Amino acid sequence: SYVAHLASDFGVRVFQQVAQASKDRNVVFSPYGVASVLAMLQLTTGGETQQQIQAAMGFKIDDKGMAPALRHLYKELMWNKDEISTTDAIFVQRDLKLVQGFMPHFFRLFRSTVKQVDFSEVERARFIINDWVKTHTKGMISHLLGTGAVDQLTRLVLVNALYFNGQWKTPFPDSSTHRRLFHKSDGSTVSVPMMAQTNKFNYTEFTTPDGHYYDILELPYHGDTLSMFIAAPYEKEVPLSALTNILSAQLISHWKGNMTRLPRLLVLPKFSLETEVDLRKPLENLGMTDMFRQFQADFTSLSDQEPLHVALALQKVKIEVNESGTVASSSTAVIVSARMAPEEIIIDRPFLFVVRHNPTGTVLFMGQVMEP
Amino acid sequence: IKGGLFADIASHPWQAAIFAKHRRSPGERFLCGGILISSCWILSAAHCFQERFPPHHLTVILGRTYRVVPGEEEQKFEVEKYIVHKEFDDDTYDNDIALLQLKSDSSRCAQESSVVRTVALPPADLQLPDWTECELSGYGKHEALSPEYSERLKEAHVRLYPSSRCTSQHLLQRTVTDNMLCAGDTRSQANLHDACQGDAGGPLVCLNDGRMTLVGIISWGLGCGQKDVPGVYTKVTNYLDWIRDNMR
Numbered sequence: 293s294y295v296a297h298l299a300s301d302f303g304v305r306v307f308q309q310v311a312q313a314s315k316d317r318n319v320v321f322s323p324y325g326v327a328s329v330l331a332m333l334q335l336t337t338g339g340e341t342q343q344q345i346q347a348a349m350g351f352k353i354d355d356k357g358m359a360p361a362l363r364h365l366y367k368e369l370m371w372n373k374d375e376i377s378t379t380d381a382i383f384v385q386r387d388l389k390l391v392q393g394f395m396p397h398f399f400r401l402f403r404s405t406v407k408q409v410d411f412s413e414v415e416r417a418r419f420i421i422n423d424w425v426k427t428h429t430k431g432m433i434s435h436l437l438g439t440g441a442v443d444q445l446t447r448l449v450l451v452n453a454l455y456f457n458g459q460w461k462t463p464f465p466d467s468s469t470h471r472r473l474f475h476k477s478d479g480s481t482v483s484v485p486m487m488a489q490t491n492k493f494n495y496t497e498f499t500t501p502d503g504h505y506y507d508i509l510e511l512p513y514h515g516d517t518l519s520m521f522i523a524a525p526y527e528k529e530v531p532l533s534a535l536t537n538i539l540s541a542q543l544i545s546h547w548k549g550n551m552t553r554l555p556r557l558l559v560l561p562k563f564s565l566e567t568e569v570d571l572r573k574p575l576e577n578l579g580m581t582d583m584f585r586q587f588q589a590d591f592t593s594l595s596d597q598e599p600l601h602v603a604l605a606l607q608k609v610k611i612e613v614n615e616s617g618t619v620a621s622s623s624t625a626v627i628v629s630a631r632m633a634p635e636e637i638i639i640d641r642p643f644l645f646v647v648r649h650n651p652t653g654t655v656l657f658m659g660q661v662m663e664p
Numbered sequence: 665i666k667g668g669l670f671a672d673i674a675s676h677p678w679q680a681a682i683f684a685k686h687r688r689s690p691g692e693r694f695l696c697g698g699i700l701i702s703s704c705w706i707l708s709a710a711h712c713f714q715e716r717f718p719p720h721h722l723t724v725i726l727g728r729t730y731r732v733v734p735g736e737e738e739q740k741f742e743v744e745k746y747i748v749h750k751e752f753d754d755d756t757y758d759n760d761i762a763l764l765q766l767k768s769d770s771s772r773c774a775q776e777s778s779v780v781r782t783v784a785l786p787p788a789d790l791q792l793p794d795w796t797e798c799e800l801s802g803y804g805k806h807e808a809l810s811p812e813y814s815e816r817l818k819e820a821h822v823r824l825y826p827s828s829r830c831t832s833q834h835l836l837q838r839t840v841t842d843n844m845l846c847a848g849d850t851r852s853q854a855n856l857h858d859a860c861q862g863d864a865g866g867p868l869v870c871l872n873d874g875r876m877t878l879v880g881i882i883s884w885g886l887g888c889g890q891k892d893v894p895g896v897y898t899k900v901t902n903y904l905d906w907i908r909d910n911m912r
Contacts, residue, residue: 468809490861497688505688526688554715623836626886627808630757631895632712633694633862 293652295351295361299327300655301541302349307658309574311536316477318565320609320659324365325452326571329380331362333450333602335398339590344580359401366403369649369656371517375458376656379428381451383409383421389597414442421451425608429455437568438606446603448589453608456647456657457617458520461512462491463625464560464615474561475528476663477642484664486561487615490627490634493558494551500538504530507637508547509558519650520657521547522560524643532642532660541655544648557634563664564612571605611657613645665802666889667849667857668820673729676801676819678783678867678878680706681725682764684717694731694813697802697866698724698764699878700782704773705911708865709883709898710752710762719743724766727779730816731803737779741766747910749903756839760883760898762865763910783867784877786901794826795850798870798879804862808888813862820857822847822868825894835896836886843902845880848894858895860888868897 303323647657680698696712722743744767825846849856868880880897
């Protein structure tokens, strides 16, 4: 399990770069997605390009123990009740010189395969790519906005995408979702729909190394397997940049520790975000410029006939947050059931959400919520 | 309080408030309602203190009509200690009752007036007939969906559901025990009378021998104010030997 808390540590640093560049945007990002693909591209690298990403992740894959660990994540995480869509996709030209003793080596360690496509037919390339995503994201992500940069010169491209919905151990009432005033970072107050529940929640108050006090809250999914955390400062003027720039995997593991089950009145806004990130910039911001230099890509572990390069590297995430879908006010969760006046926790400030596989600590999702 | 109308604290001079201080901010927040049984002792609901507030965090307010706006003959106290029932179920809300004590100099806290006086305790032999109309009071939310709480005391009247209609089956399978008590509005024309979020620890007073006597303490209910879905209360008559044995 030493890969779980380590691979997720990588994806968080592939988020600090994304958030500081969105400055103030509805960002959604999967730390597991960027990690599950970089370790795959790790097998196809050598020289500095291998070290450029092995020093950023902090481990190797060809070494014992850490290669079959990705299979067990991809196997255990798919726990599931039709919610997630984990898929990896590397695209390349057809009829290229592969090393003798490599294609066996890739299929064995990942329980996955390489996806053979055609770049000469730029038209049918955008279809096979998007329909490999249409069938691997449960149809919730079909059209793409990065396939336009595809030409005949483009030779290698990496993709990763996931769709996330969610049940609740104690679902919000569809009947209590009221209009409310959500405060945006710039100062605008938008009429945003918000749901509200009155149950016992896992709450903890943690403070920054700067003197900034947080409301941290946990909401459980079915089987208590997956859970999403919501973090927001006490006052408004404290930006998410303060929270975001100090994220770490152990910071989530400790937040799960200092939580007590308190009776609280939650108010949380619905949201449905979609984000396509150009990972070329954050990865070149994490010490991996040797991957994209039009003729500089030390891929001697895979490419015996040269040259070759990594053209584009993106990720699309689409996260909808509602009450389990259209399951509706099925009377297992009524609004009150206890006539006390709880303390109110209102999420009217900007906030960041974090998705974690608690039985493994794997951080599945993350992102800023600036305006629903 | 769903249904009914606003109240004057003289109509229910036994009704009190409870305020727990913001753990982080300064100042009080509204917690639960209370019923003044002794001059220095009040009854409330147990689950109002599941988050174990220290006694110097609680402040009881007697003789006050509005929630935050103080009164002319009002009396304000600071809780010295409170007694939650030992075997209280923080999961089925059984044994939902808590005994609060007021702090004073010389063993006397409240003094009788037109807005403040104690309420009579029920006899252990009290079994009122079914569908008896009784009044309840509180500062809680109006509907189950109202955003904020009430800025003034509201009174409403409800009838006693019989023991047959007061079963776990009739309340979405939830546990209902003989320490509980059912009550709701049984009309056929909407806005039925029932307690709501913010009245826990409040009174359910009925007329016994021409005497308004405390019968039930507002506990829970799949509210607020539903048709043929009664509210659940704490059967006070079973804890007289808990009231009496304590507070010494």
